[PDB]
Every structure is written in C-alpha cells, then in structure tokens.
Design a binder for these strands. Structure first.
Ligand code: NA
Ligand code: NI
Ligand code: NI
Length: 327
DNA sequence: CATTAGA
DNA sequence: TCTAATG
C-alpha cells in the first residue's frame, strides 16, 4: 500500500504504455500481475533478486526493479514520458469515443492534437465527434448540487411518462459523494422482466421525454436496453449556462433491479466485501441476482428480491445505508 | 463483461 | 462478422 508504491506505480506506468502506445497485450499483461503480486508482498523489496522470488517476476521486470531502486528513476520510464508519439497517444485517448486503436491510427495520420482533431472533423465518428465538441465539459466534475437538480428533473418526466416507472440514480452520488462524473440512471418497469420479451419502447419513451423537454441533448448510443448520451441544465435567467454532462439510462427486468441497484451502488469494495460474505452465508451474488449455494460445489436458483433489504436479509447482514456503503 | 456502432 | 470503445 506504500512500502512497495514506487514499484507498483512505475510497473503500472510500464504496463499501460505497452497496452496503449504499443500493441503488447502480453507484456502489458506481464507488467500488471507482477505489479499486482509486488503489491501484496508485505515487506520492502530491497532488491530485484528479492522481488524475483516472486511469481510473475522474471529477469526483465526484476532488472527493472533494481534500476528504480538504485537510482530514483528508470530510463525506459523517462524516454517514453518524453516521447511525443506516445504522449499524444495518451492524450487523444481522452476524447470520449477515442480508444488506443483509433489514437494510434490518428497519429500515424499525423492527428495529434485537439486542433488537429477539429481540422479533420470528418475523420471522426458521431461519438468521437460529440466527445470532441464537449471535451472540456466532459472532463469536468459533477457537483452534487447539480446532481440534485439533475435527478429531480429526470424522475419528474420518468413519472410524467408512466407512473409505473422506477428510476434510481446509482453510483457515488447515491452513496453521498460530494461530486460525480456522469449520472447513472438505473431504470425498470413491472411490465419488463427476465422473460417478458422486452419492450424496447420502455427505454424509448423516457429518452424521448427528456429530449422533448431539452434535458437530453445528444446521443452517444441508443439501444433497446442501453442508452448513453449527454445532458444539460436549463441555463438559468442567463449569465450562467450549464456544462455538458454525460448521461446513461438503462432498462432492466423489474425482477433483477435491486441487485443491480445494490451492485452499481458500490462501492467496488463494499460490493466485493458483501459478496464475499454471501459466500459464507451460503449464497452467491452478482449484478443480476442471488442464488443459494449447493454443497456439490455450486448451485443456482435466483432468490426473490423486492428491495435492497432482501439481499441484505438473505445474507443476514446489517442494512447499510448507501451513505455508508463505502466499504 | 456486455452492449452498441461500424465497416 | 469481428473489432473497437464505454461503462
Ligand atoms: Na478516450
Ligand atoms: Ni450525428
Ligand atoms: Ni454512469
């Protein structure tokens, strides 16, 4: 957590680069397990040789570790940091819609910057285009103050359309966060579950709703179970307009809400820990359900859930307010 | 880890 | 169809 920092950080710096600027899936894959295991080791790596005893640690990384340890740097680490092409790749990546593949592609073309990106707006797809348009807002944080306003509106229309609608704004927001990065909206309806062969319109209704009243302004990707867009708060009585903010709505079988609800609510660790618990308590938890464990090794049979409580009761745990779902 | 776009 | 990119 801190005695192997410099090792874990450089190593990750190492991993990410092969992953991105290079196409070395394995190397990359190599750098991460080590940085993973060099992470769990309870003592101060004092030498490569020392490290080396590790699993996944070979001659290459170890050699590396000696250099880092000896001198407070790595050349391999310094050259790349310096490298313009590689730089650029990391940057271009920042364009929502922009992935390593395309970032590499734009580069060879000579598209390095932001401006280079604009000047060839033609070269981008919708997504990337959108992203291009809202790069500054895109990167900005979401004050809960606003998260407050946002949610308001959204349950509003949701309701408006059909009163049978269940919207919940999940994630860090849900957990009290003073700030967020995009809103996540969990959506369900009775009239939609596990079997009941869809009702794409269900999602459909609501997205339309939001646009209709101007909350929704763009479309990043619209599917029959997963929308992904952008949004904006009606810029007041002037002098102050709201920054474009990402958005995502998702339909779900009413019979698997809460797990997902629970799940998407985190925290990652809260989840992981609770789930870990369910295991002892003879259960299995995941994003869509809750099945009791059969000694045979495993088992199935999704237990009925009506609320965040049910899952709790099941694994006979203390109800934890989302506030305190931190871990 | 699944959904969407896209070519 | 596969491959990319988001979450
Ligand atoms: Na990106
Ligand atoms: Ni368009
Ligand atoms: Ni979200």
């Amino acid at each position: 957590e801190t005695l192997n920092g410099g090792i874990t950080d450089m190593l990750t710096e190492l991993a990410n680069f092969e992953k991105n600027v290079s196409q070395a899936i394995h190397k990359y894959n190599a750098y991460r397990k080590a940085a993973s295991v060099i992470a769990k080791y309870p003592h101060k790596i004092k030498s490569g040789a020392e490290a080396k005893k590790l699993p996944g640690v070979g001659t290459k990384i170890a050699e590396k570790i000696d250099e880092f340890l000896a001198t407070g740097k790595l050349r391999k680490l310094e050259k790349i940091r310096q490298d313009d092409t590689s730089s650029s790749i990391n940057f271009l990546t920042r364009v929502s819609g922009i992935g390593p593949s395309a970032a590499r592609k734009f580069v060879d073309e000579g598209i390095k910057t932001l401006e280079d990106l604009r000047k060839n707006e033609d070269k981008l797809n919708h997504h990337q285009r959108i992203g291009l348009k809202y790069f500054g807002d895109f990167e900005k944080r979401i004050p809960r103050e606003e998260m407050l306003q946002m949610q308001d509106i959204v349950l509003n229309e949701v309701k408006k359309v059909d009163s049978e609608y269940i919207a919940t704004v999940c994630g860090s927001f849900r957990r009290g966060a003073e700030s967020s990065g995009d809103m996540d909206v969990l959506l369900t309806h009775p009239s939609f579950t596990s079997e009941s062969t869809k009702q794409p319109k269900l999602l459909h209704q609501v997205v339309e709703q939001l646009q209709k009243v101007h909350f929704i302004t763009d479309t990043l990707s619209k599917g029959e179970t997963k929308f992904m867009g952008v949004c904006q708060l009606p810029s007041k009585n002037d002098e102050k307009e709201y920054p474009h903010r990402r958005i995502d709505i998702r339909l779900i079988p009413k019979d698997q809400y809460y797990c997902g609800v629970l799940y998407f609510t985190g925290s990652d660790i809260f989840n992981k820990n609770m789930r870990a618990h369910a295991l002892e308590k003879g259960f299995t938890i995941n994003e869509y359900t809750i099945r009791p464990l059969g000694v045979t090794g495993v088992a199935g049979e999704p237990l009925p859930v009506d609320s965040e409580k049910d899952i709790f009761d099941y694994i006979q745990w203390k109800y934890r307010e989302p506030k305190d779902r931190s871990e």
